[PDB]
């Protein structure tokens, strides 16, 4: 039987990255929202880079948001988020800061302890737009760069 709410989670199709701070490779910022487990957007690693880093992502229609699950890079902990920010709008524009948070890493603090869909919650917002930023990451540098592999999205 289903996971109370899995009914709400938005088809990738409906979900355009236009926006992330950098790219590196062909970790495109649309491979965040592809609905491909295996492809990844990843910030760029060169000398200059850092966090935090953005990905903007714009819905088909505005739609009231309570949740999106982040998925970790599945091969590699390069660019975990262990810390971010979630931010919506209407109008790619003006926009309202819903929730900071953290993702839970092991005893060490330089691991996830979940590797699969991690759940960012928070109370429902009317919303076309969501900007997700990483503010600290882990990798063989930390807090340095991010990657995502998806964002799924739930609202009504
Ligand atoms: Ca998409
Ligand atoms: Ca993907």
Known sequence: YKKAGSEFALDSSKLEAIYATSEADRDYKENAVDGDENTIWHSAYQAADKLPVSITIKLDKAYDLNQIDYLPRQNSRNGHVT???????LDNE?????????????????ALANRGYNPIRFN???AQYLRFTALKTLGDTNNKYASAAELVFYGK
């Open 83 to 89: 810390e971010y920010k979630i931010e919506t709008s």
């Open 94 to 110: 003006n926009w309202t800061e819903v929730r900071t948070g953290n993702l839970e890493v092991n005893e060490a603090g330089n």
């Open 124 to 126: 429902t917002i009317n």
